[PDB]
């Protein structure tokens, strides 16, 4: 109407500026030394390729839906928009997979081959925007629009176009994001269960050497034995090495527990200090792997990727819903004029919120990421 041109214009300026900055910094200072940087670079490049043709739609909506740029530019702009959707989707799925691999299983050739394959697949999935998209002079008037053409045989094509967006743009990719981020959460849970339980075991180990009576030592060993049993369950995602590490450990708490029961504080504290030797020989190699996995969540790249993935799917939720309502209407499942008018009057609004993430992805670097050196240098 009147805000779509303005929203499109602000998206264009902010996104092109931010994505140029992101490409510059990633390629110059980050130097593509990480797989996540290659996928983020490709995401920024896809956003730039989308924003290049964005001014055409801003003026096209501004001049009351009139297209003076020709059939070739109509095809190219539609293909660029669909390509942006599909390429961003695939790059986010690969970013989530890479984050899962980095978190749970601590490769540039495969990364670049995957980027090329993603670009080719996104270009192929935008083929309907190239084939069935031509300028259309409305009746005998001079008004020209960039319309989506069909045929008699392709009567189910509008179903195919709408369902392809839901499935290949939201449904299947969101499963992989959920699958990867659930396995990340499972690994972070067992990395924190082992770390939190050992802190309880380590906090009370300072109490034993500090206390000077049998009652305080026995009460401290009681909470050390329960933490040692809990930690033995938090097996990191070779099995006997972890289990036998705590079978020895709980066996030394018992020896210290049956020395504090006799009121022998000197031997209860001496046997408690023997848990240092068991920790280093068997358990210390797993507290580092638990700490290394636990502090990767603190990495700013993890925040950036999670913020980009979270906002992209949330911004596309309203559009995929109304796309799914539209295909039901085409199927005739929903037959009501009241519902149809709501879908038609909300499609342009949701199509603008869906592509608003092109100008917010660069801003997630400044907010989530703390490494905005070149953002202040430049």
């Amino acid at each position: 109407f009147v805000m779509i041109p303005t929203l499109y214009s602000i998206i264009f300026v902010v996104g092109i500026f931010g994505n140029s900055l992101v490409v510059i910094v990633i390629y110059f200072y980050m130097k593509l030394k990480t797989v996540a940087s290659v996928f983020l670079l490709n995401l920024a490049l896809a956003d730039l390729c989308f924003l290049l043709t964005l001014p055409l739609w801003a003026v096209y909506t501004a001049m009351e839906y009139r297209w003076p740029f020709g059939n070739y530019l109509c095809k190219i702009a539609s293909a660029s928009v669909s390509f942006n959707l599909y390429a961003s989707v695939f790059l986010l799925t690969c970013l989530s997979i890479d984050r899962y691999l980095a978190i749970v299983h601590p490769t540039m050739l495969v990364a670049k081959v995957t980027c090329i394959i993603i670009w080719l697949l996104a270009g192929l999935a935008s083929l309907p925007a190239i084939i069935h998209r031509n300028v259309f002079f409305i009746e005998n008037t001079n008004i020209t629009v960039c319309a989506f053409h069909y045929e008699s045989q392709n009567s189910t094509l509008p179903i195919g176009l709408g369902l392809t967006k839901n499935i290949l743009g939201f449904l299947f990719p969101f499963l992989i994001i959920l699958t990867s981020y659930t396995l990340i959460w499972k690994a972070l849970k067992k990395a924190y269960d082992l770390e939190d339980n050992w802190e309880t075991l380590n906090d009370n180990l300072k109490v034993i050497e500090k206390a000077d009576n049998a009652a305080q030592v026995k009460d401290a060993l009681t909470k050390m034995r329960a933490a040692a049993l809990d930690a033995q369950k938090a097996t990191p995602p070779e099995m006997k090495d972890f289990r036998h590490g705590f079978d020895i450990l709980v066996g030394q708490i018992d020896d210290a527990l049956k020395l504090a029961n006799e009121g022998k504080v000197k031997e209860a504290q001496a046997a408690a200090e023997q848990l240092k030797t068991t920790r280093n020989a068997y358990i210390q190699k797993y507290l580092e792997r638990a700490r290394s996995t636990l502090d990767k969540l603190n990495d700013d790249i993890f925040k950036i990727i999670m913020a980009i993935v979270l906002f992209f799917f949330f911004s596309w939720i309203p559009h995929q819903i109304f796309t799914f309502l539209d295909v039901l209407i085409q199927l005739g499942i929903i037959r009501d004029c009241r519902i149809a008018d709501i879908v038609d009057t909300a499609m342009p609004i949701t199509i603008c919120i869906a592509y608003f993430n092109n100008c917010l992805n660069p801003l997630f670097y400044g907010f989530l990421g703390k490494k905005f050196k070149r953002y202040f240098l430049q």
Partner: antibody
Amino acid sequence: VQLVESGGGLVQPGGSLRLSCAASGFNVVDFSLHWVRQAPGKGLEWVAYISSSSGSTSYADSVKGRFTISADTSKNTAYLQMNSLRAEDTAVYYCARWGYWPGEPWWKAFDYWGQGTLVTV
Amino acid sequence: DIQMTQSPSSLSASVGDRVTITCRASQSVSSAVAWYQQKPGKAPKLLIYSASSLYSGVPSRFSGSRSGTDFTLTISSLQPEDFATYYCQQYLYYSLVTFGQGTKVEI
């Protein structure tokens, strides 16, 4: 695998009574034999235990200083010696079995309880 | 001196019904909680050990669960021989054995 109590009966308050925990099947050295008493109409209360492998006798605060638990490897029995019995010690005494820590036998708690004996003061 | 608490002191249910017994520990005992069935005049019998495992020779209808400090015993389908007294025991250490108050299941 069964634990059978013995020596229970009616004794005067303040006297001395010895209970037995003769067992068949397993060996006393491989398991720690505990004692749990249940007052008539009340729940179970842990009393004392022995670890015949090394000797780790322990008692509850209500019985510590009066009760004494010992085991005989040759006879495969555990003896609980009671002293200064009062009106609070009249309960059904159960002798329970509990494995040692390394492995699953520890995680299996009292699983083969004794048949149960009645002690009345 | 970890104290075990069983809120449902008395439960009444019919055959085939679902009965849930909860248990809470004073300290953060690990998954070391055993459930026992004691018919009147008989020694208790172990049903659930490690707060989740099922003892050998025990019907599968008995189910044990742990939620941090909260331990729950559940029976999928009640039976005429399932009416007894159930106790909650924490066995974190030999000298640290404390049983629950005891819950009686009625018809």
